[PDB]
Symmetry: D2
């Protein structure tokens, strides 16, 4: 009944998509490929997690397989994705989570080994991009290689959809205050392509470029060219926040914005877009599976046409659960 | 001789204004009041600083006085500011740095003990407010009680002045990503008036309200009612950044904004407004005495009339040096 | 079963309340805190940066704090002798403010109708207990007792097993401790303990602690044989003890592992844990053990001189031991 | 200040040895090899430092050379250390700072390119190991490949020397509470050989093995087999502390220990072993060039034969200055 899934890469996204699949029970993980992490080490990395705690259940290495809650998973150690025998392991969909095979040409290598569909758990320069709750109904059975966009695009797009649908976004500029990530360094070190990103992550607020706001214009075509932004990386291990400053076409009193976001969080976007009026801080969203949670108290309006809206996101758990939800949606359309 | 100064409070601002006074030599500190920090403890707190390093000169306790670089300072321990005998110590100007006597009525208590003028090192609901380089020439000898605004207003106002003078700010919304402060808590604790501020400072990104952007409209009267904003407190010990999203009246290409800001930093705002095109991060501004440093590479434009401008500020050292600069300017007008 | 009142809604008071609402060992019926009003108590109990959102419901209703539908009377008294514990029905009181730790000061709660007081901190003169080590020495004549500190509850179960099997001739302890509420975010005033005022995020801070000396009161045979100190480091929770000790009988490191594992699997089950996994501090977040021996982290110089490592969630282990001590006291009435 | 030096690796040790060489003027850096960091990036990494601040001087790229304070430095980009043309660049001594060529066989590759002597800025399994102030007089001109031990061994050995010389160490066990390092990860990531070291550095206290205490037994042969220990990595960017628990041969009152350590710090170990009775914390040692600073107030004695001694070390700046001091000592004996 559940679609069988293969995961390429056991980095942060790969492990948390695997954890979301077992926690939610929406899909069945049957294979994992990682050429640099051996089976005994995969048991340790999956079982203990500094951010989300110990896995609830059992994890062990048995007969060359990773056995999670009694379910044996085939382990591959291939550097070339076209050589992974996904079909022999029974993996129908493959989550491409390494971050280095994000074009349709590179991600398509998984079809050579027998996968039926590939979900890139990152932005893609050319694959169709989806955000659950915003454009997932535009998915169709002819699309064999798709992208789930980024964690930041999944936070901004549901909020931008509600605001644009009700008031019309003339233009917007976004800032994301983002938790540290695996690409950063503990102390000042080499990052040849992005010099600021090499600076010590524990000591600094680091400005960074991000295509997340521009990507919202691809998922919501009416907002193409109307949004852009940037990021600041700060020394917190997890949970990030979006700050969208936008100009509205129709007048919107701040209480009217709260009303429409609250009603959207209770209907078609339930579990995707959250809403709170509580005095929350980032740790209150630790392991929260929403893509975006509107913080009513934190935002501020200058006038009825110019406002700053705040939305929280667990950049690890929200996104990993959306990858699983996208695959469950795809399976329902077969 | 140089103006003789009394400092009320030996907290973070009081100690760093004392440090800036002795390092710049622009004024002479002759008295310090603090009811909770005794003399031997003041020596220790002034000598060692986790953020700015050990004091460059000498500091010791001798015959009941705090002696800095051979200069003896009378120490008072009064809870009620109207009882501090400033005149008996020779203090002419008093820096009111406790944060709890910020109205002209409360700060005016220092005139009862013999002070001639009082400088509130914080925003005031009613005192005239100044930002060096923006409106300090509006100071006159009839003003006995004034405010130096906040560190954040001193960062935003010089940048907003240059942008408004050249292109005209129709409206703007600001976010400041701010380093932790003394009012925050190490672990979740009580903060009855501001619940989010009680949450653990090391673990969280904390939204906070700030009147800094609205205060720029008092310092630059043409911007009254055209700016507002909010803050996020993040776990860094020092150095903060302003993110101003504004709508411009005249078209401004991003290279034209860079040209205008660079010219201001090299001329009338030299030492107040800095400019950089380097790949900087927050630690690069540790102990930097500018009020604001425009980060050309970090900002982003959506179009010629809607842009996001970034400016760094050492929230401790920039502001403490501006308090001394303001007092030196006031003394020159006597 | 026993009805309890909590004095103070700081970190220990809230987490003792949270632990009490994880089982039915005790029932919280009253809370006193003159500085935190009812609506703020709802917020502070509901959201916790370290241990996550409370799993149940929490709301203010008719002037009472209602947790999982169970109402609690709220008092706002600065003087402990004035709290009306008896009128609320509180038989035992957890004295968690940290400022009424002598038997004279903690005894003020008996004036309001409480039968027994449990000081959730070390006391200069009250009998001190550590569950699993000397709780069987508790007697119905003791109306005011102390549950020692989180650090003493980590060291004492391990020191008991080591001393029982090999004999501790002498020991020196270091605890690498997570930040606490008494610390400061940036360099600020701490008149009595100057190093503790220095910015907690920026520094490793040495600190004095009577925890190792207190083990000698809990285990009388170790009186005068242990002392130590602490380093506060910038982590929000979870701490570790490092006990360097000289043993009377020779003990190979595998023999130490065997006796600690045996104690964890039987008589000290749920109090002293044992692991051979490649653990780090976050692996003990919200772990309710008092002490978890880290077999891989320790090191022996020889059969008589070793360094033993044990982890403790300084918030959750201790708060659960306060509740366990009260359940034990109730079984003895 | 006359031996010409080549530096292999421009990681944190390589950059800080280069900074110490120009700050002290004791040696002349003439060449640097790093195959992954190009010239323009070396300028940036050397100029800005999150921990120690901006370089005091000038640094530019000119005609393919890195020019520091007007001194041109030849830049090599060789992966194979036997192919670096040290002799052609005039480099007489080579600092091997990559951490991957620490045996005499591997470090000996620099002799193929014309270097006369090699100093491994890390522990070596077989090279002679030195600690300035403890055994540097045992260096002789027949030793072409030597090691300067580790930052932790340089902290413990000067203190252990004074304690052993005066009271005799029967046995000792050390714990070092260590700042984070470049080998750690920002979030839980792969560290196949040392699993605990892959866990998120910002979130955890991490136990780690270290041969530093055992290495003191090689630098002070009388202590061979009498010391061992372990480490805890904690989330601070720099500055570490040693905690030595030792049993003494002769009785020693804690005041006698303070007296002999203070005397050593004022005489033969001046600049190597420091001494303080102040209420210090780790940030008070930021950029401190001592190898070890005894903290009199932090330690504790159980009795006259069993004590815990505490000593601070700036793990970056102390050690980098000792590498330069060792090379200036070797140059003086040529």
């Amino acid at each position: 009944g559940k679609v069988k899934v293969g995961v390429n890469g056991f980095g942060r996204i790969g492990r948390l998509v695997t954890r979301a699949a077992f926690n939610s029970g929406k899909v069945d993980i049957v294979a994992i490929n990682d050429p640099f992490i051996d089976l005994n080490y995969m048991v340790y990395m999956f079982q203990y997690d500094s951010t989300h705690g110990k896995f609830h259940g059992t994890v062990k290495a048995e007969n060359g397989k990773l056995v999670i809650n009694g379910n044996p998973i085939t382990i591959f150690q291939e550097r070339d994705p076209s050589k992974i025998k996904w079909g022999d392991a029974g993996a129908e969909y493959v989550v491409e989570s390494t971050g280095v095979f994000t074009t349709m040409e590179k991600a398509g290598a998984h079809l050579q080994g027998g996968a039926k569909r590939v979900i890139i758990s990152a932005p893609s320069a050319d694959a169709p991009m989806f955000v659950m709750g915003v454009n997932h109904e535009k998915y169709d059975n002819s699309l064999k290689i798709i992208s789930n966009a980024s964690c930041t695009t999944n936070c901004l797009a549901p909020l931008a959809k509600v605001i644009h649908d009700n008031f019309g976004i003339v233009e917007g500029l976004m800032t994301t205050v983002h938790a540290i990530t695996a690409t950063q360094k503990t102390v000042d070190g080499p990052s040849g392509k992005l010099w600021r990103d090499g600076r010590g992550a524990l000591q600094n607020i680091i400005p960074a470029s991000t295509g997340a706001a521009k990507a919202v214009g691809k998922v919501i075509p009416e907002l193409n060219g109307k949004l852009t932004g940037m990021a600041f990386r700060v020394p917190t291990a997890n949970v990030s926040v979006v700050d969208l400053t936008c100009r509205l076409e129709k007048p919107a009193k701040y209480d009217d914005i709260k009303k429409v976001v609250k009603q959207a969080s209770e209907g078609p976007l339930k579990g995707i877009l959250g809403y709170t009026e509580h005095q929350v801080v980032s740790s209150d969203f630790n392991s929260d599976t929403h893509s975006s949670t509107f913080d009513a108290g934190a935002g501020i309006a200058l006038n009825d046409h110019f406002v700053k809206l705040i939305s929280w996101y667990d950049n690890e758990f929200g996104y990993s659960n959306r990858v699983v939800d996208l695959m469950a949606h795809m399976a329902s359309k077969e």
